[PDB]
Amino acid sequence: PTMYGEILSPNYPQAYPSEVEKSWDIEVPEGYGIHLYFTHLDIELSENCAYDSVQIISGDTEEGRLCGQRSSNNPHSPIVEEFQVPYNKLQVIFKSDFSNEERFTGFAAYYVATDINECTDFVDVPCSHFCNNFIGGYFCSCPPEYFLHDDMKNCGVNCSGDVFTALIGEIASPNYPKPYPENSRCEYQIRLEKGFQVVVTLRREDFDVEAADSAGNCLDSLVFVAGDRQFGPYCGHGFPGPLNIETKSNALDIIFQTDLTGQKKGWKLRYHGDPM
Template structure:
C-alpha cells in the first residue's frame, strides 16, 4: 500500500466515532458501541430520549464496565435531564466492591440525554454499558399541585375538578363561583368584564340627568353574590335625578 494510503487509513482509524441517536418509544434499551466486545477508543455517543407529553422517564443500567479513573476523567457515561447534569459514571459494576450501580434516574420532564465518551486509550478491554428506559406517568398532583380544589392524576395526564357550586375556569386549573349578571340599575348601567369570583362591576348613572347615590363598585363574593366592596353588603345604589332634571321637572310642573 502506498504511503499516502497508509496515512489516510491511519487517520480514519484514529478518527473519533461520533454517533447521535434519537429514541422515542415508550420503552427501549441501548448500549455503548460494540457491546459486549468492548468499546473502542475516542468514542462519542449520545442518545436523546423523548417520550410523549404527560410522561416522565425512568432510566437504569443493568451493566456497567467503563475504564475507572478519578472523577471519571477518562471514559464516562453522563445523564442530562430536567435542566440538570448528573455526575459522570464509570467503573465496573461487577468487580469493584465500592462501586454501586447507580440507582434509577427519574425525570419529571419528557426528555433525557445520555452521553458516552471514551478517551484515546484503554489498558484493558472494557465492555461498556447496557441502559434501559421506560416512560412512566408523572403524578402532576404531587409534583406541582396545579389545581386549587381537586386534582385527579391519570396515566399520561391529570385534570382538575371543583367543589359543588363552583365551576372550572377557562385555564382548566382554578375553580370559582359565578355571580351571574349584576342587577340592573334604573337610569344607570353596569360595567363589568367577568361575572366570576373577585371580578368587579362598576355602576354609573346617566349623567348629568341622574346622579349616583351609594357606592358604585361591587365585587363577586365567594358566596356567589355581588357585594359593595366598601361595606361588603349587597345594598344596591340608586340613580337620583340630577340638577338638570330637577330644574326641568320643576319647570314642567309650574
C-alpha cells in the same frame, strides 16, 4: 418523543471501540419524568473516570459519571445503577479513549417515562380547590355550584348576568345574609336612561366584608365603576363610604370580588335614579 427505549454502548455486548464519542438525547412527553437504569456496566476504570466514561446529564446539572466493572449483587434485579429525574429530557454521553488493554464490553441501559403528580410534586398547588392527577397531565375540579374559570385553574360561583334597568332596585352579595362565596367575581350592571344618574344607598350596618391587610389593601373588595370614576375598593366591618353616593353617571358597574379565604356576611345596597 418516546415512552421507553434502550441505550447500548457501541458494539455491545462485545468490546467497545477505542476513540469513540457517542451521544444520546432522550425525550419523553411533557407531564412525564424519566427513569434511567443500567443493567450492564463494564468500562475501563480510572480516577474521576478520565479515560473511559459514560455521562448522564439531566436538565441543567450532571446526574452521574460512570466507569469501572460492577455487577448486580441483587439476584432479583439486573440493575446496577439507576436515575430518577423529574424532567422530560435527558442526555447520555459515552467516551472511550485511545486504547483498551483489557476486554471491556461497555454498558446497557434502559429508560421509561414516569408520570408527574402535579397535585403533590409541585411546590404550589395548580388548582384553587381540587386537583385531579392523571397520566401525562392533570385537571382541576370544583365543588357543587362552582365553575372553572377560563384558566382551567380557579373555581368560583356564577353571580353575574342580570342587567338592571329599573329606576330603583335592590342588590345584595350572594347568599345574603349568610357568608358570601370564595374565589368569585360578581358583576352587576345598572343601566338607566341618559337623563338620570345612579345613586347608591348603602347602610353602614348592611356591610361586612373581610378586613384589609396590614398595608391597607382589600383582599375582598366592593367597587363601583362609573365610566372613568371609581368608587372603592371597600372593605371591613361597616360601610366606610357615605350613605348616599352620587355616581354622576347613568351607567354603573358593581364588582364584588373575593379571594380563596375569609368570608363574612356580605352586603346589601339600594340604587335609585336621579334627574340631571
